[PDB]
Design an enzyme around this catalytic site. Sequence first.
Site, PDB file in Angstrom:
ATOM      1  N   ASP A 135      12.862  47.576  45.003  1.00 38.15           N
ATOM      2  CA  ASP A 135      13.957  48.340  45.882  1.00 38.15           C
ATOM      3  C   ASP A 135      14.513  47.538  46.930  1.00 38.15           C
ATOM      4  O   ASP A 135      15.185  48.085  47.955  1.00 38.15           O
ATOM      5  CB  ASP A 135      14.000  49.829  46.313  1.00 38.15           C
ATOM      6  N   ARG A 139      20.441  46.811  52.971  1.00 38.90           N
ATOM      7  CA  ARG A 139      20.365  48.208  53.329  1.00 38.90           C
ATOM      8  C   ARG A 139      18.748  48.611  53.666  1.00 38.90           C
ATOM      9  O   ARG A 139      18.474  49.227  54.496  1.00 38.90           O
ATOM     10  CB  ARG A 139      21.036  49.178  52.488  1.00 38.90           C
ATOM     11  N   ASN A 140      17.965  47.958  52.857  1.00 35.90           N
ATOM     12  CA  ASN A 140      16.672  48.211  53.121  1.00 35.90           C
ATOM     13  C   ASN A 140      16.043  47.166  53.830  1.00 35.90           C
ATOM     14  O   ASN A 140      14.525  46.969  53.921  1.00 35.90           O
ATOM     15  CB  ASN A 140      15.861  48.194  51.538  1.00 35.90           C
ATOM     16  N   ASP A 153      10.265  49.378  54.188  1.00 35.34           N
ATOM     17  CA  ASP A 153       9.421  50.035  52.847  1.00 35.34           C
ATOM     18  C   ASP A 153      10.552  50.670  51.985  1.00 35.34           C
ATOM     19  O   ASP A 153      10.757  49.720  51.041  1.00 35.34           O
ATOM     20  CB  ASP A 153       8.447  51.078  53.533  1.00 35.34           C
TER      21      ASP A 153
END
Length: 287
Positions: A135, A139-140, A153
């Site tokens: 993922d 943005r992560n 995470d």
Amino acid sequence: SPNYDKWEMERTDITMKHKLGGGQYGEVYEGVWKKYSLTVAVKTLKEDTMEVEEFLKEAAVMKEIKHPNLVQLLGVCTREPPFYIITEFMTYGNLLDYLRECNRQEVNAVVLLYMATQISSAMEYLEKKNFIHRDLAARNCLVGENHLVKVADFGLSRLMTGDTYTAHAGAKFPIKWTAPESLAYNKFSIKSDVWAFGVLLWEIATYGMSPYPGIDLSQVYELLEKDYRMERPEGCPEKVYELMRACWQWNPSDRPSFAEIHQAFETMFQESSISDEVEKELGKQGV
């Protein structure tokens, strides 16, 4: 107690402040953990709780990993239904939101390549230990002071085998970051996360622009399945584009390892990383 955590500390010891993404990043707030007087990031999970699995998994991974290029746990509170996840306060927010609102004159190609080097290093820690992100996105990722970027995470799990289809139903949030193989068969592997890393490389080089912008979501599936992958960002070096396009390799068996990807970054960032042999700077990306 079986659900006890030494990382779990009293909520009363934290004084909350301004929400850092209560609008469209979950129930995220700013705080200060009094007994150290250090500003922190506080995730609450009270309202919709769409993904108890994913927020509770963030706590589980952060207890099994620690590195300055993975968002470090400052504490938790899982003793209570409004579950809390306490992490460091990253000044500039998500890497996506930072690059879109940053001064491109300061945050130029040279830092952007360095972000991708830090992130590939961060991922290499996970991969070494048989953890997967599945993922991976800007943005992560988060950015703080000294232009520091770190992977977070957000659905981080244990890869273990990576023997295809290693997932848990809702094993993705962002569809345009999800591989054709993952869209068609819902299959994840280490190579499906390499695709997500390639899309991240694209984001960084485009100053946080969205993959395949202006083409319809119901058509995203179609084109990605027909082997479509994003083009060279303007101002992105050819050498970085070879790597970027290779991360979007159609065949997983022909797609590069993190080893090959790391060596590609390590050689490129020692053309830029010398920062001494090259007098009068090196590399200018305008827009």
